[PDB]
């Protein structure tokens, strides 16, 4: 089936993706059928970026699990780009619902999800970010 090339990451997975020119950006691994384009080349994954909803063919080597958060979260880009803050929100919101986490503005709503993420996604850890 699709994405069976002996590489990491399958459909539904929350990831950081690295496009030349940009900070690591949050994405979801999607099937090529959702993209309205074509099958990915071997060793690549279609992702849909949080915040803008666009599609990219990205190598599996330029993707890491979103759960490795503090390692790829980019504090500078977060302070500089409103689009990145926007992206964080939609990314973390999706993570929250998956992990069965709940929290009590925008920057104000982001704050505890950001802390949860940076803190290691407690109590479930990264296990709680899986699809299904
Ligand atoms: C998602 C990209 C293409 N890596 C950057 N998008 C910036 C505007 O949201």
UniProtKB/Swiss-Prot annotation:
Q: What is the lineage of its organism?
A: Eukaryota, Metazoa, Chordata, Craniata, Vertebrata
Q: What is its subcellular localisation?
A: Nucleus
Q: How does it assemble?
A: Interacts with BAZ2A/TIP5, SUV39H1 and CBX4. Interacts with UHRF1. Interacts with DNMT1 and DNMT3A, SETDB1, UBL1, UBE2I9 and ZHX1. Interacts with the PRC2/EED-EZH2 complex.
Tell me its family.
Answer: Belongs to the class I-like SAM-binding methyltransferase superfamily. C5-methyltransferase family.
What's the PTM story here?
Answer: Sumoylated. Citrullinated by PADI4.
* Entire-sequence positions represented here: 215 to 351 of 853
State the protein's name.
Answer: DNA (cytosine-5)-methyltransferase 3B
The gene for this chain is DNMT3B
Q: In which tissues is it expressed?
A: Ubiquitous; highly expressed in fetal liver, heart, kidney, placenta, and at lower levels in spleen, colon, brain, liver, small intestine, lung, peripheral blood mononuclear cells, and skeletal muscle. Isoform 1 is expressed in all tissues except brain, skeletal muscle and PBMC, 3 is ubiquitous, 4 is expressed in all tissues except brain, skeletal muscle, lung and prostate and 5 is detectable only in testis and at very low level in brain and prostate.
Know anything about its domains from the record? The PWWP domain is essential for targeting to pericentric heterochromatin.
Say what the protein does. Answer: Required for genome-wide de novo methylation and is essential for the establishment of DNA methylation patterns during development. DNA methylation is coordinated with methylation of histones. May preferentially methylates nucleosomal DNA within the nucleosome core region. May function as transcriptional co-repressor by associating with CBX4 and independently of DNA methylation. Seems to be involved in gene silencing.
List, for all copies, the residue spans of the domain called PWWP. Answer: 11-69
Q: Which domain of life is it from?
A: Eukaryota
Organism of provenance: Homo sapiens
What disease is associated with this protein?
A: Immunodeficiency-centromeric instability-facial anomalies syndrome 1: A rare disorder characterized by a variable immunodeficiency resulting in recurrent infections, facial anomalies, and branching of chromosomes 1, 9, and 16. Other variable symptoms include growth retardation, failure to thrive, and psychomotor retardation. Laboratory studies show limited hypomethylation of DNA in a small fraction of the genome in some, but not all, patients. Facioscapulohumeral muscular dystrophy 4, digenic: A digenic form of facioscapulohumeral muscular dystrophy, a degenerative muscle disease characterized by slowly progressive weakness of the muscles of the face, upper-arm, and shoulder girdle. With disease progression, other muscles may also become affected. There is significant clinical variability and incomplete penetrance.
